Design a protein around this ligand. Structure first.
Ligand code: NA
Ligand code: NA
Ligand code: ZN
Length: 404
């Protein structure tokens, strides 16, 4: 009977600072989820990153989950031509969020480049069960979600075509958002069709003021931050969160998978003594205190791969329960006790596939109004039905109509 589940997630590693963050976590047995960019492994990410490969190894060997944050954090969209100094050059101008997404197909493909680079530096990385780079992602700058067919959100103010959010003159038009936001959405949809889930966050453990001379020194204290977590528990934090560009618009408040869960976003580089402040000296103790008080307050920690629980032999499932099985999201059709010979599948009558994907897919519960893509063409679902191999969109003229 825990008060809730916290998902500690760390963005933008692997860097030298990741090693200290992991050792703090390890001292208390907590597992984190790390959303890595492989450009630190190549030494072009403008951080202290000579130990990036040791950090990647440490994360995997001590049981933390590694997920896909893209190769270079979309920095290629921040400069005219991407190269070894694009990182520092984009740091100099601070325009990370300006035209952050441009060509969605290419931007998505940098999530796959990420995988290739990981495997070049750590060639046996897919022999690790806690390596999830092919299945779990998070978009840079974007509190966007792709969890189930019916659990999606987009961060409609996350990135801009011109003005930064705080800057005088900034308007975010939700009914017609920035071109960069529009591309980020297509990127979400592209990753979901390759089988990813993308997760945003409920709370962003960040500087209480990004304007003071050493911003890392103003990271929220642990007591105050456990307070933020308490506040977000079952209160649809992704929509209420500030600033505006951190919001997740359309988040399905009260959706069952999000009950009693808080996903915390933070960055290893905030726990480093360096160009941003006394991270290691002042904030590593804050992190270690939070881990103590959060358990005392009744929370437990988990990693994002369990956010949707894995299908288990012997569990009682209710109609409507969500699981993953071989990385695929499923929704129980019938209350029943799972057993070894009837796991979810593309022909199971006990489950339907509920991936957040939009390509036409077997054993999906389709609704009137859904749109599916099949053999390069888009089709509207006219009639609710569970899809099967006899009823491919191109030949079933009753259940589907081509958009043309
Ligand atoms: Na798998
Ligand atoms: Na998946
Ligand atoms: Zn990031």
């Amino acid at each position: 009977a825990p008060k809730g589940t916290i998902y500690l997630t760390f963005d933008d590693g692997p860097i030298n600072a990741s090693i200290d963050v992991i050792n703090v976590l390890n001292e208390q047995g907590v597992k984190g989820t790390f959303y890595f960019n492989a450009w630190h492994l190549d030494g072009i990410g403008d951080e202290n990153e000579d130990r990036a490969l040791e950090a990647l190894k440490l994360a995997l060997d001590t049981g933390h989950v590694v997920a896909n944050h893209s190769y270079a954090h979309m920095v290629h969209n921040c400069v005219d031509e991407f190269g070894p100094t694009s990182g520092a050059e984009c740091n100099a101008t601070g325009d990370h969020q300006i035209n952050a997404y441009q060509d969605p197909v290419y931007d998505a493909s940098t999530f796959a480049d990420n995988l290739v680079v990981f495997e070049r530096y750590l060639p046996n990385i897919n022999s690790y069960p806690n390596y999830f780079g092919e299945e779990l992602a998070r978009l840079p700058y974007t509190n966007g979600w792709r969890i189930t067919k019916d659990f999606k959100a987009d961060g409609l103010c996350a990135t801009s075509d011109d003005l930064k959010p705080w800057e005088p003159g900034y308007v975010c038009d939700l009914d017609n958002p920035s071109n960069s936001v529009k591309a980020s959405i297509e990127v979400q949809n592209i990753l979901a069709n390759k089988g990813y889930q993308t997760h945003g966050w409920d709370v962003d453990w960040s500087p209480e003021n990004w304007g003071i001379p050493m911003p890392a020194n103003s990271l929220t204290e642990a007591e105050a931050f456990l307070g933020y977590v308490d506040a977000a528990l079952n209160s649809c934090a992704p929509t209420t969160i500030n600033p505006i560009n951190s919001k997740a618009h359309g988040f399905p408040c009260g959706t069952p998978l999000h009950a009693d869960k808080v996903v915390v976003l933070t960055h290893e580089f905030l726990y480093e003594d360096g160009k941003r402040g006394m991270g290691a000296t002042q904030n590593l103790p804050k992190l270690a205190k939070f881990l103590r008080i959060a358990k005392e307050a009744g929370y437990v920690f988990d990693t994002i791969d369990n956010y949707t629980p894995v299908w288990q032999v012997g569990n009682a499932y209710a109609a409507g329960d969500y699981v993953t099985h071989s990385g695929t999201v499923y929704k129980a059709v019938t209350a029943h006790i799972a057993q070894q010979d009837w796991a979810p599948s593309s022909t199971s009558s006990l489950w339907t596939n509920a991936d957040p994907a939009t390509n036409w897919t077997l054993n999906v519960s389709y609704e009137a109004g859904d749109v599916v893509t099949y053999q390069g063409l888009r089709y509207l679902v006219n009639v609710p039905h569970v899809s099967q191999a006899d009823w491919t969109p191109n030949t079933q003229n009753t259940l589907f109509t081509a958009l043309r």
